[PDB]
Amino acid sequence: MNIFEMLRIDEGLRLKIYKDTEGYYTIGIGHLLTKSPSLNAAKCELDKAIGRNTNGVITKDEAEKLFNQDVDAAVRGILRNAKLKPVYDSLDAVRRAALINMVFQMGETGVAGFTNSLRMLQQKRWDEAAVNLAKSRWYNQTPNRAKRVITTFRTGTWDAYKNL
Amino acid sequence: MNIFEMLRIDEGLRLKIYKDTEGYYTIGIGHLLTKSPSLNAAKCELDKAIGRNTNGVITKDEAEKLFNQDVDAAVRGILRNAKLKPVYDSLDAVRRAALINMVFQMGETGVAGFTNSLRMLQQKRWDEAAVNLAKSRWYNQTPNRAKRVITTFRTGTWDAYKNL
Numbered sequence A, B: 001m002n003i004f005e006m007l008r009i010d011e012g013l014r015l016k017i018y019k020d021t022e023g024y025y026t027i028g029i030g031h032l033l034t035k036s037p038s039l040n041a042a043k044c045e046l047d048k049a050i051g052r053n054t055n056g057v058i059t060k061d062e063a064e065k066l067f068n069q070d071v072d073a074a075v076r077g078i079l080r081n082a083k084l085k086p087v088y089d090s091l092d093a094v095r096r097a098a099l100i101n102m103v104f105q106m107g108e109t110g111v112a113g114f115t116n117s118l119r120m121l122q123q124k125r126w127d128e129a130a131v132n133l134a135k136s137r138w139y140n141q142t143p144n145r146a147k148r149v150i151t152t153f154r155t156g157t158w159d160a161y162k163n164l
Helices: A003-011 A039-050 A060-080 A085-090 A093-106 A108-112 A115-122 A126-133 A137-141 A143-155 B003-011 B039-050 B060-080 B085-090 B093-106 B108-112 B115-122 B126-133 B137-141 B143-155
Strands: A014-019 A025-028 A031-034 B014-019 B025-028 B031-034
Touching: A003 A060, A003 A093, A003 A143, A014 A039, A025 A039, A025 A060, A031 A039, A031 A060, A039 A060, A039 B039, A060 A085, A060 A093, A060 A108, A085 A093, A085 A115, A093 A108, A093 A137, A093 A143, A115 A126, A126 A143, A137 A143, B003 B060, B003 B093, B003 B143, B014 B039, B025 B039, B025 B060, B031 B039, B031 B060, B039 B060, B060 B085, B060 B093, B060 B108, B085 B093, B085 B115, B093 B108, B093 B137, B093 B143, B115 B126, B126 B143, B137 B143
Parallel strands: none
Antiparallel strands: A014 A025, A025 A031, B014 B025, B025 B031
16 A cells, blocks of 8 residues: 555546546546636636546546656645655655645645644644544535545554455 | 737737626737636636636736737638638738728638628628628628728728727
8 A cells, every 4th residue: 555545445446537526627637627616617627637628537547647647746845844854754654645635635735734734744633634634624525535534643554445 | 900909909908807898808919819708717728728827817918929829820710721722822912901800800600601691701792791790790790990990891992900
């Protein structure tokens, strides 16, 4: 297990534009196209992301390339951010995947706002961090993935992703 | 006077996205970005049309390139269409500009639907064509330009664009 397998489980794979559970247009492995309610906006953003007139449908290799870029963007965002980098640097490889997962989903700015949870993870207070993360808006926005990500931070194991 | 000067008068020039009188996002010299109500859709379509992240603002040379492409697209659309080509081929240079003007605005499919007006222009019944065009939905959608374009078809002169 690693960050790629973890996110494949949390995001699933689609080759056509679809709306996530919050209503946002998404494609590939969790690639957010726009938060605009406009399908035409999403269709244009897709064409921009891929470099051709896709007519709303991508290939398997195109999905993999976007996923590679999106994971790298999350790591880049962590590394540039003064609140995220120290936490990332302090974590073991499994817990680093849980952090990248959160930034992949919510972005650098969003995750950097989890001030108290970040502090608890840096202090290695795993149980208290898990309790605190479960109070966040994130926990109800995407509950299935949030519970698995929190188990990962709590335990430092892949228990939540076993057999998935 | 020619088609370029004619359209500069009818469309005006803007270097930032604006909405036309029908509410559609437009830029440059009458370059329609989208009929979607979404500004985000329009912003993405602009980036696609130009080939860079424009942040909603283009250069004078970029406006000229889009205008060159858009006039050529209108001529290409006339030449491929069985209802438009015979009319175009029959018209003098001034009246051909009035026809290109209409196709630049409404598209090949749209203008090809003016069955009776097209027939009258091919038959050189200028007065009757002018009366008939003034009954169309186009005449009330964009009345200032429609009156000038109709004068051009009626007279075969540039009278309607003199000093503008």
